[PDB]
Amino acid sequence: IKRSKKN
Amino acid sequence: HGVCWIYYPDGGSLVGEVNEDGEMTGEKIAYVYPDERTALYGKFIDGEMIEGKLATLMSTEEGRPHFELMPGNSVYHFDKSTSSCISTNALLPDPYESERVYVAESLISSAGEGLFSKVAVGPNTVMSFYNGVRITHQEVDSRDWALNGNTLSLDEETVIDVPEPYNHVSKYCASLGHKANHSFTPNCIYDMFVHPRFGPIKCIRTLRAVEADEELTVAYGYDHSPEAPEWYQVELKAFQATQ
Numbered sequence: 001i002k003r004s005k006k007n
Numbered sequence: 008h009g010v011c012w013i014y015y016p017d018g019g020s021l022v023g024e025v026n027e028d029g030e031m032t033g034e035k036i037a038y039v040y041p042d043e044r045t046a047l048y049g050k051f052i053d054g055e056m057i058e059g060k061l062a063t064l065m066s067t068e069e070g071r072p073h074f075e076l077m078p079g080n081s082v083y084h085f086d087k088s089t090s091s092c093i094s095t096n097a098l099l100p101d102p103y104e105s106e107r108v109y110v111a112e113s114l115i116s117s118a119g120e121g122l123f124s125k126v127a128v129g130p131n132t133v134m135s136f137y138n139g140v141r142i143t144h145q146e147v148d149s150r151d152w153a154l155n156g157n158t159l160s161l162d163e164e165t166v167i168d169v170p171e172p173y174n175h176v177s178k179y180c181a182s183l184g185h186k187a188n189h190s191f192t193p194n195c196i197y198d199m200f201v202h203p204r205f206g207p208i209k210c211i212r213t214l215r216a217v218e219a220d221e222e223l224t225v226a227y228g229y230d231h232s233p234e235a236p237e238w239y240q241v242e243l244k245a246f247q248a249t250q
């Protein structure tokens with residue numbers, strides 16, 4: 001659902 | 008003459024004499040990048056950059072820094088992005104980043120352009136900045152992947168993006184973090200960064216030693232199942248079948 005890069 | 012240094016977790020810092028109120032306000036305040044050498048010296052109000060000129064921290068004696076200005080008329084100012092404005096000067100590069108990375112054709116097949124190192128550096132070195140417009144997670148998560156190639160979560164409330172046509176260096180080069188391609192064996196990570204021009208953003212920091220001309224990669228970190236762009240899922244499978 002989360003359509004962004006993450007760290 | 009009581010000089011103050013304020014260091015951020017990322018390695019950058021603010022240095023100068025505070026006013027009667029105890030704030031970084033004056034014509035001789037400076038932001039020093041993580042290399043503790045590259046700096047933006049000039050007018051700041053309460054720590055906020057009004058007019059910073061490219062300079063070099065030559066030396067420090069008992070906490071007192073000595074800066075010498077770099078040639079040229081390169082001035083910068085706090086220019087935080089909004090949801091619709093990425094930068095007041097999209098074609099003015101960042102001086103620290105300009106000396107560390109460059110864009111070229113990626114070594115990854117069919118990956119377009121990539122970000123490369125200009126120098127050999129050790130682990131934990133900040134190399135590039137990931138600035139962009141600020142939008143909500145709802146806006147991002149509720150739209151097609153075709154529009155989320157450059158989205159990067161900043162925090163629980165904000166997502167940074169470099170939308171068309173800013174994804175083209177000819178249109179935007181203030182920062183270049185969005186040009187780093189993905190890898191499941193990355194040599195860099197996205198880390199928090201407090202920039203004097205861009206404000207709170209993220210940076211690309213090395214995980215280990217990198218050589219001059221080595222391509223910088225970061226793990227995009229999309230959700231996985233033991234949603235993401237097709238190219239990502241493909242490379243994921245290919246990765247699982249080696250190691």
Ligand SMILES: Nc1ncnc2c1ncn2[C@@H]1O[C@H](CSCC[C@H](N)C(=O)O)[C@@H](O)[C@H]1O
Pocket residue numbers: 113115116117118119120121156157174185186187188189190236238242
């Ligand atoms: N490992 C990889 N394999 C194939 N394409 C990749 C990739 N990592 C990144 N990309 C490509 O780069 C996009 C993210 S932005 C990275 C910059 C981009 N290559 C450019 O030239 O502007 C993705 O949408 C995808 O098209």
